[PDB]
Design a protein around this ligand. Structure first.
Ligand SMILES: *[C@@H]1O[C@H](CO)[C@@H](O)[C@H](O)[C@H]1NC(C)=O
Ligand SMILES: *[C@@H]1O[C@H](CO)[C@@H](O)[C@H](O)[C@H]1NC(C)=O
Lengths: 49, 49
């Protein structure tokens, strides 16, 4: 929902990476949310139980 | 230069109840850091190395 000037293409975050973009073919404001959510947690009781 | 005597003394006659506030840290921010998503962002040869 930001204010992209027509030359402004790349939104940067505080972490200085790519945040918000625009298609060079069609003028449109986009937002990016990265994939690879978290890790694997395993719950188990005692094996003898 | 607080005075001092041989046969005289100073005894309090009235008091004051003061509230003192201490601040102690207890919990650091718990942090889990994955290594592969940190180092090798979307790669195979990086993980093989
Ligand atoms: C207590 O100390 C003072 C300090 O000079 C002295 O003059 C006095 O004689 C002392 N008291 C006694 C009982 O000696
Ligand atoms: C003791 O001190 C308080 C303030 O510190 C005062 O308001 C009060 O009247 C005093 N009382 C006596 C008996 O000296």
């Amino acid at each position: 929902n930001k204010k992209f000037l027509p030359f402004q293409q790349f939104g940067r975050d505080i972490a200085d990476t790519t945040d918000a973009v625009r298609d060079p073919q069609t003028l449109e404001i986009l937002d990016i949310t990265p994939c690879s959510f978290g890790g694997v947690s395993v719950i188990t009781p005692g094996t003898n139980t | 230069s607080v005075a001092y005597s041989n046969n005289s003394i100073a005894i309090p006659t009235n008091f004051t109840i003061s509230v003192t506030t201490e601040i102690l840290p207890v919990s650091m921010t718990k942090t889990s850091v994955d290594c592969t998503m940190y180092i090798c962002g979307d790669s195979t040869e990086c993980s093989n190395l």
